[PDB]
């Protein structure tokens, strides 16, 4: 579709950016060594500052479908998403918070997602004292390599699962797809009970094979 | 049990040191000037340098159970993993990846689980591009907090599955915990097929409601 | 009334703080040594980060009837307002903008009332080239020592002058006072016309002797 | 006319040059890295010291018709008008005071009207605790992209208004300006009583729509 | 006598503070580090500004005898110098220039004796190209531990010298003391001419043993 | 005769530079951005540093007859002192103190002389409280702007002066000049005793206009 | 032959530098700016991180025959070292130890040799209290200016002194080099005993004049 | 006997503290936070600036057998051994230099013993690409704990060996020690020739056994 302007070099738009091959990417970065690492990245480099409106501008915000900011503070990422928000009030923002306080902050400021990196890293390292199976569950199934992958399939308009719950359904005896949320809008259940009735919309966030997939796909066809 | 050895203080350590509520932790840091908000948080701060083996022998290392590394730099988490590896050769070691290239090396130089944020961080940025429903599950099923929980519930010598196949072990449908994995030992298998027999000593990795996870260990008991 | 506080410290709090004696001032700053010129001037001083929202409660943000912005730049100053606006969303905040810029960002933050000191300057100094009668009326009008003040004056319910024109009404040939705007809300109407009509609740801003403000209170008075 | 020397680049010589566009401007700075905005600006860049008395002598202070004098601190602020009130003794100087104690060190030095942002930002933001109309006031007459403008409007030799109080003069009413004050030399009187009589060569400060305006300039004809 | 106010910290008033023991001497500036290194000199520390008129009235100027400003910058001696002038108009300052073009402002900003150093050396190392018996004169005429003194010896009233020309006293032969001026009020005059009269009041400014000064004091005495 | 090369740019090197005019000077610093001031006060530019010897070497120090050597502090100026005495062991060096105690190790390193303007400074600034006649006499016959002059003439070989002392001489009696002091090498007595037997290369130090001194030259001829 | 690589710089790799003269030298660092005294020392200048492997794949550290490793800390260096062994399994690492403790941690991590020069320079300014003979000689003979140089001088195969001990062979007499050790694979042996019989591929270490290693090198030929 | 003063704090004075146990060893540098490590080694500390004579003089310089300087730069070591040469002119200096083109500087300044690690250490590096046998006899004859040592001998008064020449001694037959060279004072012959003629008071510089050392200082004994 669109282009995907990135305000702010990091690490994390570094991978962002690795994960990103084949769409147009815009880099809006201050610093000015560091276009050879964006050239050879495969993405456009802007010069300027993200926080300025002028700079914002430039890097095109305005036809862009997702701007991801991910700068050196939490003060200059709510800064740019407050300029963002002045050039484009429709576009997605994806933020990145450096500290867990200023989440809710970052989300009054107009980011649609915020990405905490270190409360999710610091969960890890607690959580993997005894025996790290939630890390290695995390960081392979986020990573498309391997066999199993985690893909989201919409219910389309006029299919065979309208009203239909899951306990009537049951998608992992039919398909084998391991139904691990059902989404609608902004908000996601995770573990649904047995009542919850389907519609036409939601998004069921599986973890399955792809031929897995595809047999999904066409079980809740039109 | 025995205590936690957190070498260098960042914000991952930070939230690793609130996740770690009801244990002793020591913390040791070349940083005077972090006394108070490691005391804060109920932990025993030790002065030192993490790299160096005096200073890590301070720390009592020999009589951790676990020792997390985050420190400023990768080439300094490697020196400290090898400084802990010269004192005591079967401590449990977790580790955080500043960069991706670092990780072999990593495991390589001892840490048994390596934790790289900025790879996760950038993977949920690029896959939040439409809709953010897999950002949303990692970063919701995490928290101590929610209704759900990813728990780890290992199976007793005795039980009745010895042997039982996933197929007609049918544990969503009398239970109602999600199974996302079957562990053992240093593997994970994601959404393991319906030929896999289980054996005493396997480690179910799920996700529930409480009460779910107690009819589940209640379904699994010997 | 209640209590107003101030985040940060520089010239222009200093001023207010000079300007608001009779009440009670609660200062938020990061600096200690600033202890002895606050506590100086008739204000309780308050140790602490006001971008943080901990330090926020701490110098009591609820319970105010205004709150004041001033820190070093205007990426902590939205911030800070937005951190204030966490806690209470119904308090007043006068934010200070650095650059022109960053305007409509801090009235999208949350600030009520946006005061630039350097547009004002610059404005001033732009217009003195030639003869300096503008800045002379400007920095004459506002200090509560002159012998005209600029005074502003509620209508209250039942009085003479509501739907009265303002010609009808001939406001300074009887009472003597300058009627330069009259506002209601978050509008000001500088220079009405002649066609436009008082109503209950309206502010009328003036300028003139302490004894015409008198006359004109009791002019409109029922 | 002739040109404007510019000691100094800040937020307030930015906006003053903002304002004074078609005129000539010698920017006199220390810094080199200001040349492109102070190109982009619209202005001459002359490299220099403002305080040394040859780098005033080169950026022509001996013909311009002001100087605007704003620097780092207040000291070399009085140390570049005393260099100015040695190059010339008749030259318009315009200062900016960081401070409330040096405006009568400024005067007395040779600044022809010294201007403090701060003063008037901490009288208008304790003006502002109820409510801000005074900022609003302030702020709007000085923009000029309002309907209404703040003119000064001089009074012409052989004037019909030459010995007439401003009581029979009656401005208001039969051109729609609102009279503020009125000046002479360097003094102004605002709100000014009714036996005040008229003279030739006095300046009145008015505000108005720029037909108001007009009307009253043909009314004060010749 | 009364005391001596020293504005500013750095080596020449650290010479003149060594200079001045047995009197009593308030040392007035911004560093607080430097309480220690004034203490052990024997003068009273007081912490201020020396630019402030509130920081210099702490310092006890109007009772001083004499005000020795030297701080880090000409423009800062400049705004003490006005500050000073402020408080008492009849004080005696000694000022320091750190660039020769400021010494006539220095002096009409209302310093008595402007002592200018990089003067004074870079007149003393052009001059010693050759042999350095200028600067080995002035260097050793200075210091309070040489043979021979430069003193200021006064002409009192009734003395037996009054009208008496210069080439009649007979001032070597007689005492032994070399007679390089004579001075009155402000003017110094260097080898004054054998038709100098002299008067009751005028100063003699000599170099000499202090026993040749005993007998010039015994030999112009009353 | 030759060259004579500076070390180093400051205020001192800049009044050297001014009373230089006609020879052919040198300069060596490490600041790049002086070369203009350096050009424009008629000396070459040498771009490096003065510590290291190669630097050293190219600009000239072999074929010189003086450096001059000022340097940011004491222990680079030693540096560069003993850099210069590596290459020449004959040419003259004139060096300046920045603090008191570094002068006998200015003079250990090899300085022919050191100049310490900061206890000339001090001295003055305490000899010029009561009232300031050193300093005047200091900087008036220092300056080769006034009446009397500070000149050195040599007794030549075959004088009329050999064995004469300074008692039978009475060169002030005949010639009018003030004889202040006699060196010898390196060594210089003020105010020489009467029986003080004159040399034939003895330096009469002294004071007197240059009529004055062409008498004297005159008087001490063949 | 081939090249060798040379990872950061600083003072021990200048003088390797200066002493690996004719070959093809270079050098990987970070900084941009030793980019003209790389050149000038006669070296390829390679921009990149040493740490990072791709950065030492430009390098061509695959076919080289020696690796020297010196870079800002320890921890770098064993990174470093790390990556060397990740690219190359057979190339030859020399490194360069800052502290003690980390020799066996750099042979560990796979240096073929680790030069640790304060170590050496801690026992020789120990050892240089009495009288410093120890220093002199090791400065002496690593020196190539002398006359007498440290050599290394291989036994070939079919030599004449396979099987005899060195008390029979005699070489010292015979030839006139001094034999302070012999060597093999990675052992050397100093001081070796008389019945020490020698084999074939001995590297013989020795020190003598360049006329008296000729005749060893005949002495010991086929 | 006496002790031993330290200026400065680095890693090679750490080893040299190291060195000498048994001894009496007084540190002096700037830093306050050293006196830990200092003080557990075994040796006193006095906080002071080593450069001044002052704080050198409450060190003990005068008393001491040897001082040994290592500063963080080589202006500072030379600034420090001219402040040492001030207090005792005949007391032993040690210093190290940080680069090459010092040394003479550090002699000239009146180091006894200049010791350059890191040209040993670039000396040891550039000739360890081959085979590594003079790093490690360099390295290994310097440590205290081998079987073979470095021992310097002197020659008692009245020996056998007076006038005996090395051919005719045949110390390595007899005693079995390694005579690698013969010092006298400042100077020492490496590889001495075969002509050459011991005296009363040289010093024999020799490697082997401790048991060959006693067995060659018994003897020279009378
Ligand atoms: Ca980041
Ligand atoms: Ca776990
Ligand atoms: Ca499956
Ligand atoms: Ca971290
Ligand atoms: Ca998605
Ligand atoms: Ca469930
Ligand atoms: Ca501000
Ligand atoms: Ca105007
Ligand atoms: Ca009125
Ligand atoms: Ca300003
Ligand atoms: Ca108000
Ligand atoms: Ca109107
Ligand atoms: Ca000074
Ligand atoms: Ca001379
Ligand atoms: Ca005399
Ligand atoms: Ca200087
Ligand atoms: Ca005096
Ligand atoms: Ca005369
Ligand atoms: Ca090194
Ligand atoms: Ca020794
Ligand atoms: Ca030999
Ligand atoms: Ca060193
Ligand atoms: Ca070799
Ligand atoms: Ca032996």
Chains 1, 2, 3, 4, 5, 6, 7, 8 share one sequence.
Request: glycine share 8%; hydrophobic share 40%.
């Amino acid at each position: 579709s669109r282009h995907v302007v990135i305000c702010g070099w990091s690490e994390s738009t570094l991978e962002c950016l690795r994960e990103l091959r084949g769409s147009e990417v815009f880099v809006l970065a201050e610093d000015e060594n560091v276009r050879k690492k964006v050239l050879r990245s495969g993405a456009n480099f802007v010069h300027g500052d993200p926080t300025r409106v002028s700079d914002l501008e430039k890097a095109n915000v305005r036809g862009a479908r997702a701007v991801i900011v991910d700068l050196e503070s939490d003060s200059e990422t709510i800064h740019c998403i407050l300029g963002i928000r002045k050039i484009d009030e429709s576009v997605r923002i994806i933020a990145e918070a450096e500290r867990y306080e200023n989440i809710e902050q970052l989300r009054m400021a107009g980011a649609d997602q915020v990405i905490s990196p270190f409360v999710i890293s610091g969960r890890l390292m607690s959580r993997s004292i005894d025996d790290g199976y939630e890390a290695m569950f995390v960081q392979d199934v986020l990573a498309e390599e391997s066999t199993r992958r985690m893909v989201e399939v919409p219910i389309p308009e006029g299919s065979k699962l309208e009203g239909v719950s899951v306990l009537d359904a049951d998608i992992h005896d039919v398909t084998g797809v391991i139904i691990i949320g059902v989404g609608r809008g902004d908000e996601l259940i995770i573990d649904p009970p047995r009542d919850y009735s389907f519609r036409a919309g939601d998004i069921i966030l599986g973890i399955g094979k792809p031929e897995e997939i595809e047999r999904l796909k066409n079980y809740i066809s039109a």
